[PDB]
Amino acid sequence: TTSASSHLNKGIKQVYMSLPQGEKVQAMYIWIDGTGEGLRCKTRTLDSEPKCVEELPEWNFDGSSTLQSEGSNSDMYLVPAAMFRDPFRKDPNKLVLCEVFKYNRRPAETNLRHTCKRIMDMVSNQHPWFGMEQEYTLMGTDGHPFGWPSNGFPGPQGPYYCGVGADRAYGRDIVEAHYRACLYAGVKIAGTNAEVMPAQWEFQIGPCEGISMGDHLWVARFILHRVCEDFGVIATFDPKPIPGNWNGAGCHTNFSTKAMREENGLKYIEEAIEKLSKRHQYHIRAYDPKGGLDNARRLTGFHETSNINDFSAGVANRSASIRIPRTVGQEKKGYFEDRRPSANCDPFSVTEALIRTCLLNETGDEPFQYKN
Amino acid sequence: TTSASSHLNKGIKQVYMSLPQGEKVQAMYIWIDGTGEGLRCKTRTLDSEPKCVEELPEWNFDGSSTLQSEGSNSDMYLVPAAMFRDPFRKDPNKLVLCEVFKYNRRPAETNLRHTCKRIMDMVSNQHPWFGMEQEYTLMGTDGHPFGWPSNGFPGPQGPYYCGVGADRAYGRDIVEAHYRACLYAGVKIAGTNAEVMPAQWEFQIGPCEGISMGDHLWVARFILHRVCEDFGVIATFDPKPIPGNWNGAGCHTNFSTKAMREENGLKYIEEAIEKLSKRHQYHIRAYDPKGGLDNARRLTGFHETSNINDFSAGVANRSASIRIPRTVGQEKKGYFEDRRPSANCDPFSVTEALIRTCLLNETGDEPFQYKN
Amino acid sequence: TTSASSHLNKGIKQVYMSLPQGEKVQAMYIWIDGTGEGLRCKTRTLDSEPKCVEELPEWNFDGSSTLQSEGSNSDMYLVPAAMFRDPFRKDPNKLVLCEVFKYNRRPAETNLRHTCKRIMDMVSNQHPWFGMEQEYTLMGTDGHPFGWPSNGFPGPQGPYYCGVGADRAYGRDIVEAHYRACLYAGVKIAGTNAEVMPAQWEFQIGPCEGISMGDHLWVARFILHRVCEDFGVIATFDPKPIPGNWNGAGCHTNFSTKAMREENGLKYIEEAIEKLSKRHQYHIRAYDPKGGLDNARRLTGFHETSNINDFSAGVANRSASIRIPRTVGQEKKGYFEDRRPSANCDPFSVTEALIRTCLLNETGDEPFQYKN
Amino acid sequence: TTSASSHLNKGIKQVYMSLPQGEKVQAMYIWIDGTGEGLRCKTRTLDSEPKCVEELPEWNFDGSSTLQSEGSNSDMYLVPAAMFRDPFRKDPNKLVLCEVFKYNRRPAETNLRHTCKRIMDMVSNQHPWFGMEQEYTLMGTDGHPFGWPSNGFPGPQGPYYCGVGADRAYGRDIVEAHYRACLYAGVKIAGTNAEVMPAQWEFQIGPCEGISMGDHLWVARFILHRVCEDFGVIATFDPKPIPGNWNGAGCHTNFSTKAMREENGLKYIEEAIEKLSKRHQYHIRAYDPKGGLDNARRLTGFHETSNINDFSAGVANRSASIRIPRTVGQEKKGYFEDRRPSANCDPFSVTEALIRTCLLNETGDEPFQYKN
Amino acid sequence: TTSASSHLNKGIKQVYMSLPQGEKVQAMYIWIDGTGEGLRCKTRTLDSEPKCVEELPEWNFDGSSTLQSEGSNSDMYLVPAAMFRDPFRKDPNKLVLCEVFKYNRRPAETNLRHTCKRIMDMVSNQHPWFGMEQEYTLMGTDGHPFGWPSNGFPGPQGPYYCGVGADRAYGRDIVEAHYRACLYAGVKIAGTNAEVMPAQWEFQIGPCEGISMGDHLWVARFILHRVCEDFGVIATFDPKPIPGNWNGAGCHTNFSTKAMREENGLKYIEEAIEKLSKRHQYHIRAYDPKGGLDNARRLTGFHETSNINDFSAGVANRSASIRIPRTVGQEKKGYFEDRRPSANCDPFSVTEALIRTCLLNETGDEPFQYKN
Ligand SMILES: Nc1ncnc2c1ncn2[C@@H]1O[C@H](COP(=O)(O)OP(=O)(O)OP(=O)(O)O)[C@@H](O)[C@H]1O
Ligand SMILES: Nc1ncnc2c1ncn2[C@@H]1O[C@H](COP(=O)(O)OP(=O)(O)OP(=O)(O)O)[C@@H](O)[C@H]1O
Ligand SMILES: Nc1ncnc2c1ncn2[C@@H]1O[C@H](COP(=O)(O)OP(=O)(O)OP(=O)(O)O)[C@@H](O)[C@H]1O
Ligand SMILES: Nc1ncnc2c1ncn2[C@@H]1O[C@H](COP(=O)(O)OP(=O)(O)OP(=O)(O)O)[C@@H](O)[C@H]1O
Ligand SMILES: Nc1ncnc2c1ncn2[C@@H]1O[C@H](COP(=O)(O)OP(=O)(O)OP(=O)(O)O)[C@@H](O)[C@H]1O
Ligand SMILES: NC(=O)CC[C@H](N)C(=O)O
Ligand SMILES: [Mg+2]
Ligand SMILES: [Mg+2]
Ligand SMILES: [Mg+2]
Ligand SMILES: [Mg+2]
Ligand SMILES: [Mg+2]
Ligand SMILES: [Mg+2]
Ligand SMILES: [Mg+2]
Ligand SMILES: [Mg+2]
Ligand SMILES: [Mg+2]
Ligand SMILES: [Mg+2]
C-alpha cells in the first residue's frame, strides 16, 4: 500500500542531511507541464544565497519529454517568478517557481500566469483578495484510499468530519507535516480540517492579493506532493476519487475588493454576484483544465453541491453556486464564496475569470484580446 | 529487494560513530582495478591530519587479487593524487584518490591519468574546461530496477522525467544523500534531475579545469556506490540496463576553452567541431572501456540519441552527435556538448581525446608518443 | 540469521544509557578460559575512577564453570594486567584485562602471558616491535556466512577483495563500528580492508613494543565479539570457515628490532630468517592453540598460502612462509613478515617463540626452563 | 487476489458430493435481473426427474430485492423456457432458464425474449442461423486482471494471442473447465482461443438456429460465472476493462439464413449488408445495454477496430464494421460477420435487430410495434 | 517464482474434467508463429472423431496478431499435416500440427516444412533416419533457473549429471509427466537424462524416418510447454541461459541411411563426413534460427565442446564437431552424430541441410533450386 522507497531506512538519510552544507546553495526549479495539472522539478547549485527572485538565472529543459514540444526546437525556457524557503533542505536553500516559454520566447500553452498577471496589474488600485480551499484524498500505491479496508469500505459517513481518533482520522501525520512545512516556506496557509469522507482532508490558503494567490496555491500543491512522497502515499486532486455515496472534492474560492471590505460593502457584493449570474457557461469552462468534464462528476446537486448547469445564489446557503456568509450579511461587508471550481482547477484561470467578469465588466464567450 | 546488510539496526552504528575520535586520523585510499570500471578501497591510520596531498605516504596492494598482476611479482604501488574530506566519517578523516603503478614503477594498464596529466600541462595556458553529465539506474539486489513491480513493468514513459510524487520518482533518498555528501567532500557537483526511465537519475559535475575533471568524476562515482551501499541498493552505469522501449544511459561532455568563452568565441567552437568531424572512429573507441561495444547497445538513433556510425552536428539539436546550445549560438560564445560518450566511460580517456583532436591537431588512429 | 536479542528495540536502551551515571564507576574484567580461545567477562562497581592499573583490586571466579579447575578447589584468581577506556559505556568506565592463577597462586594452564612477559624483559634493550594482521569471517546465527544466499553460494572470487558496493562488501557496519571503538579504547589499530571471500575482513594492530602487543590484540578481539553481539552476528577466527575454493584465515606477524630498523639493518633481518629456517616444526606447534591441527586445513600451498610441511623465504613473495617487503629490501632496513600463524593463534605464544629463536638463539624442541 | 471461499478445503466438499442423491431431483432456476446484464439463481427440490421443460412448475421471487419492482407489488413470476443438464451437480439434476413476468402477467422491462421469440417465428421459414464470439477478462477480487503484476503491467502485446506457456496464457484452468461443463450441459459451444491481451479469452457459440441461440449464450454466461466462483476469480464482460494500449472486448455476431447458404448466395449477403448500411445508428443503440455509452470506449478506430461513427464493409477486412470471410467470397456462399456489438450485449436484442432490418425490410428509428 | 495460475486449486479442475464428454470431439490446432521459435494454439469442436488427418477441415487465424502479416491481408490459413492423441484431454480428442499459408496460398516465411517435404521425397529409397537430443532448462517466472538459490548459485558442477536426490535433480516431476504424455500421444520418444548443470534436462526423439522427424520434435516441444504451464514453470531453449562456468544447451542430431546401416557401412559414413567438411559455414548458418548469433555463445571450445570457427571429427571424440560412436567404429556399421546445432534449432532446417549435402552433393553458399 506504500511505495518501496518509503521502506528504506530514513535514519540513514538524516545522518547525511546533518552534514554542514558549506558555501554553495541549492535551488529547486518548479514548473507546470503540458497536462495543465502536473508539476516538474530539478535542482542546480548556486555560488551564493540569492536575496531576491531577480538574482536567479534563467534555465531550460527538454520539452519533448514533457509533451510540451515535438521534433526540433524542443528546448523550452524557465523564467523565475517567485522564491520561497526550502523546507526539505532548510536555509539557505530555496524553492523557485518559474514560467514556461517556448523557443521563440512566446508563452507556453499551459502558461496562464502571463495573461493573468497583466489583468491583475490593470485593477491594482482596487486590491482584489482571494481565498481558496483545496480538498484532496490520500491514496495508497495500490489505487485505493489510504487506510481503507482491503477490497472493502469503512462505515457510513457522519463521524469522519473533523473527527479525532484512530478510527476516525486517517493519515494526520501527512497533514501535520504539510502544515509545518508551508509555514516555514512562507506560504500563507490559513487552516486545515478533516473532510466528510475518511482519508479526505482540506487546507485553506489566503487571503492573498492579486497574482500572489496563484503562486501560493501552486507551491502549496508541490509541498503536499513532496511531503506525501516521503511517507510513500499519493495525494490526488481528482474531483470524484470514489464513485457512489461519497463526498466529492472541490476548490472553493473567496473573492473580495477594497470597496467590498469597507462599510456598507454588501452593495458591491450583490452587484458582483448579479454580473456572475450572466456568465455561468463561461466560468464553468474556465474552472476546469478539460473544459468542465472533470467537474461534471462532482457537481450533481447532491452532498452539499450545486448543479453543474444551474446558477443559484443565497446567504448562508451551502447548496447554491454562490454563498454569502451569514456574518458577512449581518455586518453588511466582507466577501462571498464561489463553490463551483473543482479540486484540480488552475488558480490562475479561476482568479482571472473572476476579475474579468466582476471588475472589467466583460461580456461574451471569449476574453478581450487587449487590455480590459 | 535490498541487501541483508541494509536490514541491520542502523541506530546501533550511530552510537559508535558518536564517540570522540581523538588524535588519530583515518585515510581511505581509492584506486581503479584492472577492469577499468571497478573501484577498490582500504583504510589506514595516520598520526596527524595531513594538510596537503603531498604529505601522504605511499602504499601498496596485492595485484593478483584485482586481476592486475602476475603471481611472482604481484605487488602494486598506490601513489596519492588528490585529497577530499570524508563525508562518511566527517572531519578530520580524508578520502585519497591514487594512481596505480607496477612493481617496476611503470604505469598500470588501466592507469590513464598518467598520460592525460601530461597532455593537460601541454595546453595549460588555454585553460580548457569540462562538464560531464553522469546518468545511472538504481537496481535492487535481485537484478531488477528499484521500485519496479516484481516480474512486471511500470506505466509507459512520459510522466517520470523530472517527476515528483510517490508514483513518479523512485529512490530520491539516495539522490538527496549523494548531493549533500558531494558538497561536503568538495566535489564540484552542479545539479541533479530525474530521467525519463523510472528509477533513473543524473547528476552534473563541472565546470572543471584540466585534470581536475577526471579526479572529481571518479570520486563522485565512489561516493554514489558507498551511499547506495548504506541503503542496500546497487547503482549501475550500464549504457542499456533494460532492453526495449526504455531510455539508455550516457555521459554527455561539455568542452570549452578560454578563446571560446570570450567575445565572438563561436568561431573557435565551429573550428573545433569541424576537427571532430574527421575522427569519428577514433573517438568512438576512446569513449568506451571495451573499445565501443558497450555504447553500441545505446546509440541506435532512437530515444534522443545519435547513430553510432554517423557524425552530425547542429545548434539546439538533441539528436546529433554534437549539440550547440541555443543560448550559446545567440551570444556567439560559450561551449558545445558531445553526446557520444557512454555512461561507463573513463573521464581521463574522454578528456584526453578531446584535447588531442581539438587543441593539439592530432591526425590518425594512434596517439602521438611524446609532445603532440 | 540474526539473534533474537538483536531484534529488541535498541532505542529503548539508548534512553537508559543517557542517564547521568553519578559518582560510581563500572569496571569489566576480561580473561581467557580453558580452551585457549574463548573470552569471559563480568562487571563490578568501584567507588572512584582509577588512574592506573595498579589501583584495581584483585578478583576471583569459579573455575569449575569455565573448565579450568578441579572440584574441591574451584576458585581461581584474576590479577589485572592492562586497563583501557570502555567504548560501550564511555568514560569514566574501564576495561580490565587480567591474568588467571590457580588457588595456590600458580599460573593457569592457559596463562601464557606470565612466561612471555619475563622473556620480553630479557631483551628489553633491543626494543622488539610486532604487528599482526587478524582475519575473521562474519557468520549468521544459522551457521552460514553473513549475507550469503540461503543454502547457496555467491559468485566466484575476484570482485570482493577491497570491494565497494551492496553486492561486493557484506557487513561493513560492523567493521566501521569496530574501528571507532578500538580508537576510543586506546587500542593501536592500524587499518582495515575487505578480504577475498565475501563477508571476510581483516584489521591490523601495531607496531607494538614487547608484551604490549599481546594485550592489544586480545582486547581488540574482545571488542569485535562485543560489537558483533549488538548487531546479532557471530565473528569466527576459524582458519578454514568454508571448505572448498574459498580463502582461508590467518594471522600474519611482522617482526623487527632496533638493529633491523637502523641503516643497513637488512643484514640483521637475514640472520634472523636463517635461524627461523632451523625450527620449522617448533614454530608450527607454537602457532596453533591445538598443536598445529587447525592450521593444517588452511596451509595447503594454495590461495596465496605456504605449505605446512615446507619452509621457504623470499623478498616480495606472498607464497613463502617468510616474506620480505620489496620496500624493505630496497631501503636495506625495516621488518619481515611471518605468514605461518593461523587466525586463532595466541599472540603471547607467537611473540615468545619469535624472540626465543631469533634473539636468544635457542635450539631444540623444548623452551629453556630458566631464562635462555 | 482470490476470494476467501476459494481457500476452503475443496476435498471436504467432494466427499459430500459423492453421497448417493437418492430419488429427489434438484432444479436451478436462472433469470435476468433489472440491470439487464446480471443473473440470479435459486434451487428447489422436485419429486421426479422431468423429461421436458414443458412440465416444470412455475415459481416466483421478490422483485424489490432485485430492483425489478417497488414495495407494493414486488412479487414477480418465473416461467421456464429452456432446460439443460446440471454440470455442477451431475445427472439427474437440471438447470432451468426462465422468463420474468410482472404481477399483472406482463413481461418485465428486461424481458426481451418475449418480443424476440414472436419476431423470429415470422421468418422461421428461412431458418436464420447465428454465431457469436463472446470475449471476457478474468479478474481477481481486487479489481485487477488475474495474473498481472501487483500495481504493474505485463510485457507489450504480441505474444499472448493464442499463446501457450506459463508466461503467455493466464488462467487456462478456468477455460478448460468451462468448455467441458458446457459440453456436458448441452450448450452448443464451438471453440475457444486466447486473446491479444493476457488474461483475456473468448469462446464461440453456434451455429444455433432460431430463438435457441439467445438461450444458449445466456446459459453459457451463467456457467462461466459459476465456474469462476469455484476458483475464486471474477469474469467480467466490460468492453474496455483496461484503458490504454490494451485490447478491448466485443461480441462478434455471425449471421446467415438458407438463402446465403445455398449456391451463389454471395449476392444475398451483399443485399443484406447494403440494407444494414442505412441503419448504422439504430443498430449501435441496440448493440449496447446502455445505448452505446459503453461501446464508445472500444470502437476508437485503433487496435484493428472500426470507428463507432463510421460504417464500412469489405472482404477479409478486420478493420471494417462488417467482414466477409475470404473463403466465403471465393466460394460465393456462406455468412457474414458483424463486429459492432460489445461484450456485454444482450443476445435477444442483437438477434432481433438483425432479423428486422435484413429480413423484414424495416426502416426508421423506432422498432415496428405491431405484428404485421 | 511460480505463476499465479499454478496456485489455483487443481482439484477443482479434475472434478470438471471427469464429466463424460458426450459425443462431440475437441481438436487443437498448432502452428509456428512469425518468430520461427514459438508456437500458437486454438481449439475447435468436431461432430465426430476423425480417423485420419486427411479428414480434418482447414481453418484460419489473424496473422497481424501473430506478427506474420500486415493489416491489409492479415488473414492466413492453416492446413493440417499430422494428428496425435490429446494427452491433456484424453481420447477421443486430438492434437493436429498445421502448415501456414499466406492469403495467396503461398507458404509463409517460417513455413519451412513445405520445401523440406519436397526434398526428402527425392531420397525416399535411401530411407534416411534422424534422431535429435533436445536439451532445455527449467526456469521460474522471475527469470532464474528453477530451484536455484535466490540471487545465488548452487555448488560447482559434477554431481548433477544424471544425478538422483533432492539436492542433485531439480524438477523431475515435469520430466516424468512429459515422458508419459509423449508416449500416450504417440511421439517417438527414446529416453531422458539429467544434464550437467542443475535444472537442465534432455530428451531424445527418434529414430524417425523422413519428414516424420520434424513433426514429432515440434509436437514434443508443444507438449513440454503445455505440461510446464500446469506446474507454473517456463521451459527455455536458449543455447546459453546462464553465462559463466555453466553448461550450455544444444540439439545433437544423429543421421544415417540404409547404406550406413548395412554391412561395412562405416565407409559410407566416412564419405558423408568429408562432404560435411567443406560446408562448415553453410551448415552453421542453417543450424541457428538467427543465423549463428545464438550458437556463438555456446560453441566456445570449452566445457567439452567444439569451437564455432573450426571443423573436427573423430571416433568417440566428444569435443569434435562430428562424433562417430566407438561401438559404430568397432562394428564398422551404424550412424554418426552432429553436435553443431543449437537447442533452439528448427528441425526442418536441420534435416533438409543434412540431406542435400550428404545425399545430393550440393555445393556453394546457397541452396539449389528445382534442379535439386
Ligand atoms: N475578506 C476576504 N477576502 C477573501 N478571502 C477571504 C477573506 N476573509 C477570509 N478569506 C478566506 O476565506 C477562506 C475561508 O475558508 P473556510 O474553510 O473558513 O470556509 P467555510 O466558510 O468554513 O466554508 P466550507 O464549508 O466551504 O469549508 C480562507 O481561505 C480565508 O483566507
Ligand atoms: N563554459 C562551460 N564549459 C564547460 N562546461 C560547462 C560550461 N558551462 C556549463 N558547463 C557544464 O555543462 C553542464 C550543463 O548540462 P546540463 O545537464 O545542466 O544541461 P543539458 O545538457 O541541457 O541537459 P541534458 O543533456 O541532460 O538534457 C554542467 O555540467 C555544467 O557544469
Ligand atoms: N617496523 C615494523 N615492525 C613491525 N611491524 C611493523 C613495522 N612496520 C609496520 N608494521 C606492521 O605491519 C603491518 C602491515 O601489514 P599490512 O596488512 O598493512 O600489509 P601486508 O602484509 O602487505 O598485507 P596482506 O598480507 O594482508 O596483503 C601492520 O600491522 C603494521 O603495524
Ligand atoms: N454458416 C454459419 N452461419 C452462422 N454462424 C456460423 C456459420 N458458420 C460458422 N458460424 C459461427 O461463426 C463463428 C466463427 O468464429 P471464429 O472465432 O472462428 O471467427 P473468426 O473469423 O476467426 O473471427 P475473429 O478473428 O473476429 O475472432 C462461430 O461461432 C461459428 O459457430
Ligand atoms: N541408427 C540410428 N540412426 C539415427 N538415429 C539413431 C540411430 N540409433 C539411435 N539413434 C538416435 O540417436 C540418439 C542417441 O542419443 P543418446 O543421448 O543416447 O547418445 P549419446 O551419444 O550418449 O549422447 P550425448 O551427446 O548427450 O552424450 C537417440 O535419439 C536415438 O534415437
Ligand atoms: N602505574 C604506575 O606506573 C605506578 C602507579 C602508582 N603505584 C600509583 O600511585 O598509582
Ligand atoms: Mg473550509
Ligand atoms: Mg468554504
Ligand atoms: Mg543534463
Ligand atoms: Mg546534456
Ligand atoms: Mg595485510
Ligand atoms: Mg600481510
Ligand atoms: Mg474468434
Ligand atoms: Mg470473429
Ligand atoms: Mg544424449
Ligand atoms: Mg549425443
Author numbering:
A (entry chain D), B (entry chain E), C (entry chain A), D (entry chain H), E (entry chain G): 2 to 373
Sentences from the paper on this structure:
Glutamine synthetase (GS) is an ancient enzyme that catalyzes the ATP-dependent condensation of glutamate and ammonia to glutamine. Here, we demonstrate that human glutamine synthetase (GS) can reversibly polymerize into filaments aided by a composite binding site formed at the filament interface by the product, glutamine. The glutamate/ammonia binding site is gated by a flexible loop that bears two key catalytic residues: R299, which interacts with glutamate substrate carboxyl group, and E305, which is predicted to deprotonate ammonium ions to ammonia, enabling the required nucleophilic attack of the y-glutamyl phosphate intermediate. We propose that GS filament formation constitutes a negative-feedback mechanism, directly linking product concentration to the structural and functional remodeling of the enzyme.
